[PDB]
């Protein structure tokens, strides 16, 4: 309609259920609380760029470069405004 | 007393004391004070030997120096105690570092 809903929703997925709680407007689709899992694992993968075996998450590209190009930006801006 | 000192740069009895603490105010350093005192001084002499700088009457004569000779002189002296006072504060050339932050 013209209404607008506001919904915080929280969810824990495990390998045995799956649990979901909202917090806010009703969402039709989810059903609140634990569920069980059709099959014995967690059905989400975990994609980790440029894996580290001492770190949890991985690594963008960008992060290596990151400093050079504040160098870069600092160096333009600077010679764009001395111009 | 530093009152008696600029008294001892003026040759003394010529200003009261007020203008003399007037002058000690108007600049920290005593001589840069003494210097103007000075040249307030050589105003004076407008007073203490007018135009007249020789007369003769009778069989006397008396060839005062000119006003001009007196109020030099005093402007000299102005000027000396002015270029000791920055001689007191000028401190000699300098070279130091630069540091801006970079990343």
């Known amino acids: 309609g013209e209404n607008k809903r506001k919904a915080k929703v929280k969810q824990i997925i495990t390998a045995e259920s799956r649990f979901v709680e909202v917090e806010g407007d009703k969402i039709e689709g989810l059903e609140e609380g634990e569920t069980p899992n059709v099959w014995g694992f967690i059905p989400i993968i975990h994609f980790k760029n440029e894996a580290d075996e001492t770190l949890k998450y991985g690594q963008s590209d960008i992060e290596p470069i990151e400093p050079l190009l504040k160098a870069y930006h600092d160096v333009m801006l600077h010679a764009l405004k001395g111009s | 007393e530093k009152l008696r000192l600029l008294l001892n740069d003026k040759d003394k009895k010529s200003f009261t004391d007020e203008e003399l603490n007037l002058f000690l105010e108007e600049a920290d350093c005593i001589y840069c004070a003494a210097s103007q005192g000075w040249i307030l001084k050589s105003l004076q002499y407008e007073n203490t030997v007018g135009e007249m700088y020789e007369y003769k009457v009778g069989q006397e004569t008396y060839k005062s120096s000119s006003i001009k000779d007196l109020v030099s002189v ?10 000791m006072c920055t001689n007191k504060k000028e401190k000699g050339s300098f070279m130091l570092g630069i540091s801006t932050e970079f990343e």
């Open chain 2, 74 to 83: 005093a402007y000299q002296n102005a000027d000396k105690f002015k270029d």
